Write a protein that binds this ligand. Structure first.
Ligand SMILES: Nc1ncnc2c1ncn2[C@@H]1O[C@H](COP(=O)(O)OP(=O)(O)OP(=O)(O)O)[C@@H](O)[C@H]1O
Ligand SMILES: Nc1ncnc2c1ncn2[C@@H]1O[C@H](COP(=O)(O)OP(=O)(O)OP(=O)(O)O)[C@@H](O)[C@H]1O
Ligand SMILES: Nc1ncnc2c1ncn2[C@@H]1O[C@H](COP(=O)(O)OP(=O)(O)OP(=O)(O)O)[C@@H](O)[C@H]1O
Ligand SMILES: [Mg+2]
Ligand SMILES: [Mg+2]
Ligand SMILES: [Mg+2]
Lengths: 441, 112, 398, 104, 401
DNA sequence: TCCAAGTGCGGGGCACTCGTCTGTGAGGGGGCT
DNA sequence: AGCCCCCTCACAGACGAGTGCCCCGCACTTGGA
């Protein structure tokens, strides 16, 4: 067959575009220009700069850095005069780990193919000695500090005090770009580190608050591009791979689609996104989160449904994944409990409704449950042991939380609203009549 | 012994050190490198070619900490199939203490 | 991706849609993997065994490099990273050195390969709810390990909680949440009837009894037995392994009038309701000295009475707290033998503390000074049993 | 400076017109924002207000008790109000702020 | 090899070199006049004579010239808010004294310098001072023993050694032995040590130093007052030179807006560079008032109203409900339960239905990562605490207008 | 040409320490049948 | 006519940052082999 292999190639292309492809951004005509001009004036003139990309978690912060570096590094005047030192706040969780990473990545005299000698103090003295011995005739170092607040939470912020001291001195022209998500990271710094930081801040709030831009983004993320655009993209990616992400990148030169297949796929995508059910699903997702990662997760889980039995994208699949997103999980855990745990939860709900969210116990809830079980005529002869094991099963699924003594006398709290229990009573399968009568009263 | 099992880390080191030094006594590593990874490598190196059970004797079951005991039972139940573990206990009072100190998720993996 | 599903459908009946979803996401190794998958459910739902057999089949059929963990074994991060780098970079020996997350990320970056062999990596972290009780920089790095290492890997997490318990102050990345629903009565009956061939082989391999055992042990008879069993044990528990291990024993009890020559609901409904009281116990007269018994019932009388009620009785809302002098005074009040205060009596107090029959609710470091408090942790029926084997009625002093 | 004078004015106002001496940084910032809105003076953000209070801390007028989050830091005045009135030397302004009690 | 590299690095025998550029750096003729004003406005370029820092210059110069020509040793303490010409004035005094000691106008001396904020522990100060004496890196106990053998014992002809200590407040620990040893060696007769310590707080000898340390520190203090409106214009107009690139009202507005916040000079010298970079993109050659106002808006940024405008719909409903719950129950620290109840009331009013609390915890975590609210770990759902980090009027300004 | 074990020294685990914070047991104070 | 019930206040506990100390690994290394 041949109609299956085109669908497999389309699905592979779309999944490798949604997950990979770290160097292409959409939008940001001013912020990318400011970052690129700052790095270019660091590399060319030899000036020292500090910058701070700020934005919400989920916008294009790392993608902007990767796009600027992938557009700057094959210049042969940027890649030969500069060296780039990446540091991460999640991996370099101390000062000496980040300092050994700087000493490895800068290829200093005590590097020795990735094994630094000496202590932390000798590494700091040698790094400041090799930075002070430079000038405007030395290679420009570009420090990229990701998760900058985790670097602000170090000892004395001492590494930061050094990284902002070479920027305000007649030394090697370094350039410090911080990338963080906290919009008040500059209040964490000491006053000396506040003074040494050049206060330019780039804000990366996403430009898709209005819903039509969300629909155009969801249309651009599913459509198949042309042949010449894929040749141009493969040329740029091969140019940045000729000289890190680029070892495993998108590289779309492997996929060649027929023009009739591309036109049929784009016509189907526009026909589906021109309906009202697909726009209602995207309207619910846009009401929840206007971020890019949320839509890319939804589109990945929608593209993964493309089987050769049902090859096309329709509005019903979008509504199905929208219902997969919008549902609750604690209600889906509540309908998996047995009848003993459910009557225990009804007794807890009655005790919390009467005593107005007071802390309960096993003895109080067991007495309120045994006031019902003696007249239930279906749960007559259940012991204390099975009810205690059901209380432990409620305790380990975190539907009951301790106030933070024996296990039967420890106080507790109900971790649910009453509407979740009221919906669990409606969605439960094969609920007997006595339990449904006891739940309503 | 319950005195050498205050934490989970100390109990796992005591278990692996006891098994390895029982092997060294029947036929010295530091206690920093006494983990289940080294125990699985040693058991695959030595006793796979022959199954030799691994008996874990707990003489004072009541004097143990509850959380360390539950995590130890979950650790020994996680590694079954690769390492043959047999557990014996030393319960003094009654079986109701055993059924009371062992929760639902811990007693789900017990065949006593 | 359909060969793994076709190999997993016989081993896991009534788990169709979860195996289809896990074959969509992480089925083929040529396609890219999602960043992280989080499938969750209740106990006995079959998620450790499902991902274990899935990882075994993926490592058998394709070029992936699997790994399986358990986050109770990982009390610190170094053990976790050493097990991960033993499983993901095999046959390295004892020269494997991981100091922190950075060396782990670099040694996974060294494992990158070409684009023709279609490699992948698959990490499964069982008991993932402990991952938020450790050094706090392992969970976001485990979420974005695909972006960090620049590899084709997916990090699978297994827990009983929803993901709403996993958010910290700094935030997390995106995840693919997946729910394994627990079975209703019909799917549980199908699962309990899946092992009919093993039941028939076990009853064949253990003689007019066996010849009549071969003719009526068949599928409809086992279906009626499982219907009669689930009509009485589904009220307490829905978990598959407890129902399997109890249905085996109640089947071995159920068959004896058919092998000894409705007609069967009463003869099993006796022992079925006798065995409903033995659920959640996995089982396949406490002797004490005289003065230890009197000390135990004196601690019960000290915990079950108010401090202001002791002056009316002895002169001649759990258990309350008391000190050791109150216990000794109540013991010498109710003893009516008037023995001396030797070493062995206070030793009996200490070994009742060490038998978990009493406790130390507070204090416990100034026991000799007298500011330590005790707490009696026994019920009423054991106290009345001790009072019957001694002859001291506790129903008067309450 | 002007913003440090305004911060000291609102702190003296909050210590006059309120009995309990627990003044956070967020409450002081919210009073200072209304005081700047009445004077047609461009107020600062919280991230610059914290640096302003940290620069007044170096003179010895204040002392900051540290907490977990920067909104919760406690500002303790360690002078007398007549010493602040003598140190500011802006009498037509500092007599106008302490009479403008509507922002508290 | 590791062994000879460490033995030649620790002994100070190889040059700690840095790599060279393949392309030679650019020329001064290839730079435009706006580029020349951008390179001359850098914070790294210190002038040969500091404007508006003359009185403190003559004070430190008279003190150090007296202590050098008397050959007696002593201690000084200068203090001031960061950015007010402390270290630049001190090294200008020391460069003037070194040039006077080159011309045989003054007795010669040695100049040692340490900074407390580039030391990992304070005892490494002993490793650094000795490294500016001989060149060899040793341990701190051997360096301390050799410094005590050098300073306490008389050895003519001993030369005076002026020790500069930047960031003194980091050398202060629980025991306070490093600062005691540094301020104790000038009090001996055989050691000709003249130590000048620089700090930010004016009351450092009384706040955290012990009694003997503030007795040894002396009473010849110095204070660097912050820059006013008039001096901070003189600094920038002396930096720019005779070029007509900056207008007068541009520098006046920069100095007036910076000198009213902190009095920092680095803030003005970075705002002027940002204004030059703004005027470079407008294809002009002069810096008008508009580029200066745009740079003042960009550097002194307040983006906690644009962040509330750029949130989603349910997060704006969540912020409105946290503000309404703070208004209702008086106290600021709220619980997630009442917040979700007011969420349900507001969502019933507006008509849009709200997600269940399993997604409202994700909204609360997303606002906590963005630092719009202050929230705990989400492990205690429906009972976690919530502080409103933004002001309650910022929400009403961001949603009504 | 190498080397066995002292050894000198940095680094991490741990234990105290200062401040905060909140229950609380019994001495103390006000009424009682 | 001794007794019944709240007040409250410095121990009890926690806890949390945080900071110094001691064991432990580990290269140095060196006088010897
Ligand atoms: N402007 C954009 N253009 C293209 N893709 C984007 C953009 N913004 C976000 N994305 C997509 O969102 C996903 C996450 O982006 P990114 O890595 O920049 O987030 P981040 O800010 O680094 O997250 P965090 O700060 O938590 O590390 C990426 O897969 C990327 O494709
Ligand atoms: N659909 C199914 N078909 C057949 N057997 C099943 C099915 N689901 C579960 N089982 C049985 O349940 C057992 C799996 O238990 P498992 O180890 O997955 O528990 P778990 O999900 O890890 O519970 P917990 O997380 O509480 O430990 C297997 O032995 C398997 O035989
Ligand atoms: N009066 C002045 N004239 C010219 N330039 C100045 C003047 N004051 C400060 N600067 C510039 O501002 C910078 C201030 O550096 P300075 O030596 O004052 O830092 P500092 O006050 O020691 O910092 P910290 O107090 O944080 O240690 C110098 O680089 C200098 O170029
Ligand atoms: Mg990022
Ligand atoms: Mg499991
Ligand atoms: Mg300085």
């Amino acid at each position: 067959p041949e109609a299956d292999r085109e669908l497999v190639s389309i699905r592979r292309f779309l999944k490798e575009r949604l997950q990979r492809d770290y160097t292409t951004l959409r939008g940001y005509a001013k912020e990318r220009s400011n970052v690129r001009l700052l790095l270019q004036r660091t590399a060319e003139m030899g000036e020292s700069n500090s910058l701070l990309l700020l934005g919400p978690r989920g916008s294009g912060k790392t993608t902007l850095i990767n796009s600027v570096l992938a557009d700057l590094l094959p210049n042969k005047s940027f890649g030969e005069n500069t060296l780039i030192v990446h540091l991460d706040g999640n991996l370099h969780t101390d000062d000496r780990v980040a300092l050994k990473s700087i000493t490895v990545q800068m290829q200093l005299e005590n590097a020795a193919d990735g094994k630094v000698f000496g202590s932390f103090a000798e590494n700091l003295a040698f790094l400041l000695q090799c930075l002070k011995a430079g000038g405007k005739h030395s290679k420009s170092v570009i420090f990229i500090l990701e998760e900058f607040d985790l670097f602000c939470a170090h000892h004395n912020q001492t590494l930061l005090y050094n990284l902002f001291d070479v920027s305000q001195s007649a030394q090697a022209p370094i350039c410090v770009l911080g990338v963080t998500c906290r919009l008040d990271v500059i209040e964490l710094l000491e006053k000396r580190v506040k003074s040494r930081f050049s206060h330019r801040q780039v804000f990366l709030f996403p430009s898709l608050r209005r819903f039509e831009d969300y629909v155009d983004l969801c249309r651009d993320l599913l459509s198949l591009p042309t042949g010449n655009s894929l040749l141009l993209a493969a040329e740029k990616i091969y140019n940045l791979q000729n000289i890190y992400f680029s070892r495993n990148h998108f590289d779309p030169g492997e996929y060649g689609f027929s023009p009739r297949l591309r036109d049929a796929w784009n016509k189907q995508i526009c026909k589906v996104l021109a309906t009202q059910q697909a726009r209602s699903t995207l309207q619910a997702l846009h009401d929840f989160d206007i971020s890019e990662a949320y839509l890319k997760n939804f589109l990945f889980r929608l593209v993964a449904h493309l089987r050769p039995q049902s090859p096309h994208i329709t509005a019903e699949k979008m509504a199905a994944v929208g219902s997969q997103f919008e549902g609750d999980d604690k209600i889906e855990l509540l309908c998996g409990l047995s009848v003993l745990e459910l009557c225990l939860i009804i007794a807890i709900k009655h005790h919390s409704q009467i005593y107005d969210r007071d802390s309960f116990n096993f003895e109080i809830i067991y007495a309120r449950f045994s006031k019902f079980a003696k007249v239930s005529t279906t749960m007559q002869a259940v012991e204390r042991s099975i009810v205690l094991k059901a209380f432990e099963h409620l305790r380990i699924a975190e539907l009951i939380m301790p106030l933070t003594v024996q296990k039967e006398f420890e106080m507790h709290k109900l971790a649910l609203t009453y509407s979740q229990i009221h919906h669990c009573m409606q969605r439960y399968q094969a609920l007997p009549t006595e339990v449904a009568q006891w739940a309503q009263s | 012994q319950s005195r050498d099992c205050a934490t989970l880390k100390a109990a796992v080191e005591t278990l692996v050190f006891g098994l390895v030094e029982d092997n060294a006594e029947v036929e010295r590593l530091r206690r920093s490198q006494c983990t289940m990874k080294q125990l699985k490598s040693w058991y695959t190196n030595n006793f796979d070619s022959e199954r030799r059970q691994l008996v874990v004797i707990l003489p004072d079951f009541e004097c143990f900490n509850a959380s360390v005991l539950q995590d130890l039972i979950l650790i020994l139940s996680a590694h079954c199939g690769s390492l043959p573990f047999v557990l014996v206990l030393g319960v003094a009072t009654a079986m109701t203490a055993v059924h009371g100190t062992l929760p639902y998720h811990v007693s789900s993996k017990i065949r006593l | 991706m359909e060969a793994i599903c076709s190999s997993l459908e016989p081993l896991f009946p009534c788990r169709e849609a979860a195996i289809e979803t896990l074959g969509e996401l992480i089925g083929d190794s040529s396609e890219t993997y999602p960043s992280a998958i989080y499938l969750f459910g209740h106990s006995g739902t079959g998620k450790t065994a499902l991902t274990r057999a899935f990882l075994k089949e993926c490592g058998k059929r394709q070029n992936v490099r699997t790994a399986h963990l358990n986050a109770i074994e990982c009390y610190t991060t170094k053990i976790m990273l050493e097990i991960l780098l033993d499983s993901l970079a095999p046959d390295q020996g004892d020269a494997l050195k991981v100091d922190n997350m950075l060396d782990f990320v670099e040694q996974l970056r060294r494992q990158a390969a070409t684009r023709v062999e279609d490699q992948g990596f698959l990490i499964a972290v069982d008991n993932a709810e402990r991952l938020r009780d450790m050094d706090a920089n392992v969970l976001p790095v485990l979420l974005r390990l695909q972006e960090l290492t620049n590899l084709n890997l997916c990090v699978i997490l297994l827990s009983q909680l929803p993901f709403e318990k996993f958010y910290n102050k700094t935030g997390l990345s995106e995840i693919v949440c997946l729910h394994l629903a627990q079975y209703n009565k019909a799917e549980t009956q199908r699962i309990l009837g899946s092992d009919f061939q093993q039941v028939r082989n076990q009853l064949l391999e253990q003689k007019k009894r066996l010849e009549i055992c071969q003719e009526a042990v068949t599928e409809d008879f086992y279906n009626n037995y499982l219907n009669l069993f689930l009509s009485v044990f589904y009220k307490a528990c829905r978990d598959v392994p407890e129902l399997q291990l109890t249905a085996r024993k109640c089947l071995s009890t159920y068959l004896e009038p058919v092998l000894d020559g409705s007609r069967l609901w009463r003869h099993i409904a006796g022992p079925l309701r006798s065995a409903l009281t033995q659920i959640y116990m996995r089982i396949e007269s406490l002797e004490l000295p005289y003065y230890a018994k009197f000390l135990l019932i004196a601690a019960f009388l000290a915990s079950h009475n108010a401090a202001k009620q002791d002056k009316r009785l002895f002169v001649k809302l759990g258990p309350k707290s008391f000190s050791i002098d109150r216990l000794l005074a109540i013991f010498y009040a109710i003893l009516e033998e008037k023995v001396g205060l030797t070493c062995n009596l206070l030793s009996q107090i200490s070994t009742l503390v060490h038998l978990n029959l009493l406790s130390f609710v507070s204090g416990e470091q100034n026991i000799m000074e007298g500011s330590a408090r005790l707490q009696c942790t026994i019920g009423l029926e054991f106290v009345l049993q001790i009072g019957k084997v001694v002859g001291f009625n506790v129903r008067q002093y309450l | 400076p002007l913003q440090q004078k305004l911060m000291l004015c609102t702190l003296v106002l909050m210590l006059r017109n309120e009995r309990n001496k627990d003044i956070s940084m967020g409450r002081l910032h919210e009073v200072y924002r209304r005081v700047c809105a009445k004077r047609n003076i461009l107020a600062l953000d919280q991230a610059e207000f914290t640096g302003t209070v940290d620069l007044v801390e170096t003179r010895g007028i204040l002392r900051i008790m540290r907490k977990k989050e920067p909104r919760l830091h406690k500002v303790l005045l360690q002078w007398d109000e007549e010493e602040v009135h003598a140190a500011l030397s802006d009498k037509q302004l500092i007599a106008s702020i302490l009479s403008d009690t509507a922002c508290l | 090899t590791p062994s000879q590299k460490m033995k030649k690095i620790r002994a100070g025998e190889l040059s700690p070199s840095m790599q060279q550029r393949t392309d030679l750096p650019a020329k001064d003729s290839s730079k435009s006049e706006l580029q020349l004003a951008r390179e001359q406005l850098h914070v790294s370029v210190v002038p040969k004579s500091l404007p508006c820092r003359e009185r403190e210059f003559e004070n430190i110069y008279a003190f150090l010239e007296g202590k050098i020509q008397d050959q007696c040793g002593g201690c000084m303490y200068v203090s001031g808010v960061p950015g007010t010409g402390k270290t630049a004035t001190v090294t200008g005094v020391i460069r003037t004294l070194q040039r006077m000691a080159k011309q045989n106008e003054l007795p010669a001396f040695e100049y040692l310098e340490i900074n407390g904020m580039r030391l990992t522990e304070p005892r490494q100060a002993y490793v650094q001072i000795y490294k500016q004496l001989t060149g060899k890196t040793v341990s701190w106990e051997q360096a301390h023993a050799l410094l005590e053998k050098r300073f306490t014992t008389p050895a003519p002809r001993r030369v005076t050694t002026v020790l500069l200590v930047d960031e003194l407040d980091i050398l202060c620990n629980r025991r306070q032995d490093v600062v005691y040893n540094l301020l104790d060696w000038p009090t001996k007769s055989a050691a000709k040590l003249v130590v000048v310590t620089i700090a930010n707080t004016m009351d450092l000898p009384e706040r955290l130093l012990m009694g003997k340390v503030t007795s040894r520190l002396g009473l010849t203090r110095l204070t660097f007052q912050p820059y006013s409106h008039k001096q901070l214009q003189e600094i920038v107009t002396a930096r720019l030179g005779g070029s007509e690139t900056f207008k007068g009202e541009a520098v006046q507005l920069v100095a007036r807006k910076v000198a009213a916040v902190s009095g920092d000079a680095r803030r003005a010298l970075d705002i002027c560079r940002r204004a030059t970079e703004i005027a470079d993109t407008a294809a002009v050659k002069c810096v008008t008032m508009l580029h200066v106002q745009q740079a003042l808006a960009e550097m002194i940024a307040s983006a906690k109203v644009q962040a509330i405008r750029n949130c989603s719909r349910m997060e704006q409903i969540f912020l409105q409900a946290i503000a309404a719950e703070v208004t209702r129950t008086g106290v600021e620290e709220t619980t997630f339960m009442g917040v979700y109840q007011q969420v349900e009331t507001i969502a019933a009013f507006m008509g849009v239905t709200f997600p269940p609390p399993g997604r409202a915890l994700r909204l609360c975590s997303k606002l906590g990562a963005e630092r719009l609210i202050i929230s705990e770990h989400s492990r205690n759902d429906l009972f976690q605490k919530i502080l409103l980090n933004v002001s309650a009027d910022d929400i009403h300004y961001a949603l009504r207008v």
